[PDB]
Write an enzyme that holds these catalytic residues in place. Structure first.
Site, short mmCIF file in Angstrom:
data_model
loop_
_atom_site.label_atom_id
_atom_site.label_comp_id
_atom_site.label_asym_id
_atom_site.label_seq_id
_atom_site.Cartn_x
_atom_site.Cartn_y
_atom_site.Cartn_z
N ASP B 25 -18.99 -27.76 -20.37
CA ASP B 25 -18.20 -26.76 -20.75
C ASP B 25 -17.70 -26.01 -19.27
O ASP B 25 -18.33 -25.17 -18.66
CB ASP B 25 -18.76 -25.69 -21.42
CG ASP B 25 -17.71 -24.60 -22.00
OD1 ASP B 25 -16.94 -24.49 -21.40
OD2 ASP B 25 -17.98 -23.86 -22.83
N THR B 26 -16.52 -26.17 -18.70
CA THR B 26 -16.00 -25.76 -17.45
C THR B 26 -15.80 -24.51 -17.59
O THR B 26 -15.82 -23.67 -16.45
CB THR B 26 -15.14 -26.82 -16.90
OG1 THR B 26 -13.75 -26.63 -17.74
CG2 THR B 26 -15.36 -27.96 -16.48
N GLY B 27 -15.78 -23.92 -18.84
CA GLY B 27 -15.26 -22.53 -18.85
C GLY B 27 -16.53 -21.42 -19.05
O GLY B 27 -16.30 -20.30 -19.37
C1 LIG Z 1 -14.49 -18.26 -23.90
C2 LIG Z 1 -14.92 -18.82 -22.50
C3 LIG Z 1 -14.14 -17.70 -21.43
C4 LIG Z 1 -16.37 -18.65 -22.33
N1 LIG Z 1 -17.19 -19.32 -23.09
C5 LIG Z 1 -17.12 -20.86 -22.84
C6 LIG Z 1 -15.99 -21.42 -23.88
O1 LIG Z 1 -15.85 -22.83 -23.28
C7 LIG Z 1 -16.48 -21.72 -25.46
C8 LIG Z 1 -17.49 -22.65 -25.53
C9 LIG Z 1 -17.79 -22.54 -27.01
C10 LIG Z 1 -18.84 -21.38 -27.64
C11 LIG Z 1 -18.76 -21.40 -28.97
F1 LIG Z 1 -19.32 -20.47 -29.45
C12 LIG Z 1 -18.60 -22.44 -29.89
C13 LIG Z 1 -17.63 -23.60 -29.26
F2 LIG Z 1 -17.41 -24.56 -30.05
C14 LIG Z 1 -17.37 -23.73 -27.96
N2 LIG Z 1 -15.28 -21.86 -26.04
C15 LIG Z 1 -14.88 -21.12 -27.16
O2 LIG Z 1 -15.46 -19.73 -27.38
O3 LIG Z 1 -13.86 -21.62 -27.98
C16 LIG Z 1 -13.76 -20.93 -29.07
C17 LIG Z 1 -14.49 -21.58 -30.16
C18 LIG Z 1 -13.79 -22.63 -30.75
C19 LIG Z 1 -13.90 -23.82 -29.77
O4 LIG Z 1 -12.77 -24.18 -29.03
C20 LIG Z 1 -11.78 -23.59 -29.85
O5 LIG Z 1 -10.60 -23.28 -28.97
C21 LIG Z 1 -11.07 -22.29 -28.23
C22 LIG Z 1 -11.19 -21.05 -28.97
C23 LIG Z 1 -12.33 -21.16 -29.78
C24 LIG Z 1 -12.56 -22.49 -30.35
S1 LIG Z 1 -18.42 -18.84 -23.97
O6 LIG Z 1 -19.17 -19.98 -24.52
O7 LIG Z 1 -18.00 -17.47 -24.59
C25 LIG Z 1 -19.58 -18.39 -22.55
C26 LIG Z 1 -20.19 -19.61 -21.87
C27 LIG Z 1 -21.13 -19.13 -21.04
C28 LIG Z 1 -21.31 -18.01 -20.19
N3 LIG Z 1 -21.87 -17.78 -19.37
C29 LIG Z 1 -21.76 -16.50 -18.75
N4 LIG Z 1 -22.31 -15.97 -17.88
C30 LIG Z 1 -21.93 -14.69 -17.48
C31 LIG Z 1 -22.03 -14.32 -16.06
C32 LIG Z 1 -20.77 -14.21 -16.94
S2 LIG Z 1 -20.41 -15.60 -19.88
C33 LIG Z 1 -20.43 -17.07 -20.93
C34 LIG Z 1 -19.65 -17.33 -22.02
#
Ligand SMILES: CC(C)CN(C[C@@H](O)[C@H](Cc1cc(F)cc(F)c1)NC(=O)O[C@@H]1C[C@@H]2CO[C@@H]3OCC[C@H]1[C@H]23)S(=O)(=O)c1ccc2nc(NC3CC3)sc2c1
Ligand SMILES: [Cl-]
Ligand SMILES: [Cl-]
Ligand SMILES: [Cl-]
Ligand code: NA
EC number: 3.4.23.16
Lengths: 99, 99
Positions: B25-27
């Site tokens: 996860d690059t995000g």
């Molecule tokens: C939203 C991003 C800015 C951040 N996320 C990483 C994402 O890649 C996340 C990774 C992810 C988290 C999760 F809960 C479930 C999932 F399937 C994937 N994707 C996600 O939330 O996607 C949503 C959930 C579905 C999957 O993709 C779909 O399209 C995008 C919108 C939604 C749906 S995260 O998971 O919230 C995340 C991970 C580590 C992390 N580390 C952090 N460190 C603090 C110093 C700052 S904040 C932080 C936040």
């Protein structure tokens, strides 16, 4: 280009005639942009990750330019903390993860 | 490898002698894994996701294998909906984004 991961992989995008900064996000299925107007029809959607779900508007067939590369696809608009370019558009610009 | 993004970039990790599935996860700045037992002391952290914040437990200098590549670094443990390998460990395995 080759983008290292020492810092967040942020790029400039053009969407809806606007320039925005967005995160290249391999963990995101979908592309999610902060509140803005886009033309055409839309339908509501719920998306959920860490912390739970948010309601967004789903707009289909939206053209974006990502770091200079054009694509088309679905864009979700709503109260995301960060603009995210997800896999649905990363594939279209030929992005891969390499190690 | 070179991983395309037409499907989720899921890999096998090994942590505490056990195999688990996780998302490259690059995000994600940090690595977040579902509830499990890890050795040593932890420190508190909050991580902001799309739906709000979770509290997590931060464990440092944890041995973890990611797709066959050995890393040693910080793992956050908490109620994440999927196991996420973030940039702190993607950098250790030499991952880049390319297009
Ligand atoms: C939203 C991003 C800015 C951040 N996320 C990483 C994402 O890649 C996340 C990774 C992810 C988290 C999760 F809960 C479930 C999932 F399937 C994937 N994707 C996600 O939330 O996607 C949503 C959930 C579905 C999957 O993709 C779909 O399209 C995008 C919108 C939604 C749906 S995260 O998971 O919230 C995340 C991970 C580590 C992390 N580390 C952090 N460190 C603090 C110093 C700052 S904040 C932080 C936040
Ligand atoms: Cl799409
Ligand atoms: Cl391809
Ligand atoms: Cl680390
Ligand atoms: Na449309």
């Amino acid at each position: 280009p080759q983008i290292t991961l020492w810092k967040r992989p942020l790029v400039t995008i053009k969407i809806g005639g606007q320039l925005k900064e967005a995160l290249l996000d391999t963990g995101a299925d979908d592309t999610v942009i902060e509140e803005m107007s886009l033309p055409g029809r839309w339908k509501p959607k719920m998306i959920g990750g860490i912390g739970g779900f948010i309601k967004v508007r789903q707009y289909d067939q939206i053209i974006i330019e990502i770091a200079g590369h054009k694509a088309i696809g679905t864009v979700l608009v709503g109260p995301t903390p960060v603009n995210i370019i997800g896999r649905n558009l990363l594939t279209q610009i030929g992005a891969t993860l390499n190690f």
